[PDB]
From a paper:
Subsequent work demonstrated that several arterivirus OTU domain proteases hydrolyze [name] (Ub) thereby downregulating Ub-dependent cellular innate immune signaling pathways as means to evade host antiviral mechanisms. To this end, we determined the crystal structure of the [name] [name] domain both in the presence and absence of its Ub substrate to a resolution of 2.85Å and 2.3Å, respectively. Overall, [name] adopts a similar, compact OTU-like fold similar to that of the previously determined EAV [name] domain, comprising of α and β lobes, as well as a structural 4-cysteine zinc finger, and a DALI search indicates the [name] [name] domain most closely resembles that of EAV [name].
Formation of the [name]-Ub complex was facilitated by modifying the C-terminus of Ub with a reactive probe that forms a covalent adduct with the active site cystine of the [name] domain. The [name]-Ub complex crystallized in space group C2221 with 3 copies of the complex in the asymmetric unit. Direct interactions between Ub, and a [name] loop structure comprised of residues 453–460 (453 loop) are also observed, with Ub residue Arg74 forming an H-bond with the backbone carbonyl of [name] E457. A comparison of the [name] [name]-Ub complex with the EAV [name]-Ub complex shows that that Ub binds in a slightly different orientation, with the [name] [name]-bound Ub tilted further towards the α-helical lobe of [name]. This shift in substrate orientation is mediated by a [name] loop formed by residues 480–484 (480 loop), which is shifted roughly 7.4 Å toward the Ub-binding interface with respect to the homologous EAV [name] structure, and which would otherwise clash sterically with Ub. A comparison of the apo and Ub-bound [name] [name] structures shows that Ub-binding results in a repositioning of H498 in a catalytically competent conformation, although there is no obvious direct coordination by nearby residues. Stabilization of the β3-β4 loop is mediated by hydrophobic interactions between W499 and L494 of [name] and L73 of Ub.
Numbering used by the authors:
A (entry chain B): 1 to 75
B (entry chain A): 413 to 576
Write the structure that this text describes.
């Protein structure tokens, strides 16, 4: 299925994924499309901050869904 | 009334800057003093606070605050920013606080985002106390600490002295 990922600059990436795919998989795909290291990626879905362990299924991310890509900040 | 210029709180360089930022937001809300009343607490890189930690904490304490990524949420009274590696916070003085949606808090909201007025009795009573009880935990646990406190708060006025 297709999902969309929106960067902070308002770019829209289109990904091919399965509901089974883990958040880590999605990050790896984003890297392949954008050259953003997973190390510094955080994915948001309707405000809910996604976590590496879980799948798209677990977060209810279906076809056509839009995620927001955010840069990890530590201070 | 329209105002100009930027009003910023920069925490000390103790290693707890993010938590000081939240503390200061609440300290201004409650007492008009835009600064941290938390006692300084030293820690290294591996106990720094993330945008994840700060977002969770903002939601627990129910603050009119966003973490600014790129666009600042127009409805956020308090703007949290990572300045290099130092968490700082700006405040919009001439503006009533607004209760922010989650996307607004996280700072991934879109042009047109809406938020209703923050209720006067809107800051959880003992929010600042909850943060004070929690902040010296590992940063990835601080929000859990706050949530636990607020959910089941110690009722005794001098509970800290009791616990000693
Ligand atoms: Zn917003």
């Amino acid at each position: 299925m297709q999902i969309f990922v929106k960067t902070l600059t308002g770019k829209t990436i289109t990904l091919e994924v399965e509901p089974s795919d883990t958040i880590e998989n999605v990050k790896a795909k984003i890297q392949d499309k954008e050259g953003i290291p997973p190390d510094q990626q955080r994915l948001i879905f309707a405000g809910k901050q996604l976590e590496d362990g879980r799948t798209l299924s677990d977060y209810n991310i279906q076809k056509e869904s839009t995620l927001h890509l955010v840069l990890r900040l530590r201070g | 009334v329209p105002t100009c210029g930027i009003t910023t709180y920069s925490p000390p360089t103790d290693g707890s800057c993010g938590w000081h930022v939240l503390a200061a937001i609440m300290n201004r809300m409650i007492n008009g003093d835009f600064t941290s009343p938390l006692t300084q607490y030293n820690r290294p890189e591996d106990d720094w606070a993330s945008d994840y930690d700060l977002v969770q904490a903002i939601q627990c304490l129910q603050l009119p605050a966003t973490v600014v990524r790129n666009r600042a949420c127009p409805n956020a009274k308090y703007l949290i920013k990572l300045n290099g590696v130092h968490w700082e916070v700006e405040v919009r003085s001439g503006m009533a606080p607004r209760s922010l949606p989650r996307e607004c808090v996280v700072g991934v909201c879109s042009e047109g985002c809406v938020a209703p007025p923050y209720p006067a009795d809107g800051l959880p009573k003992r929010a600042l106390e909850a943060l004070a009880s929690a902040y010296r935990l590992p940063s990835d646990c601080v929000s859990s600490g706050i949530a636990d406190f607020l959910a089941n708060p110690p009722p005794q006025e001098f509970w800290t002295l009791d616990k000693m």
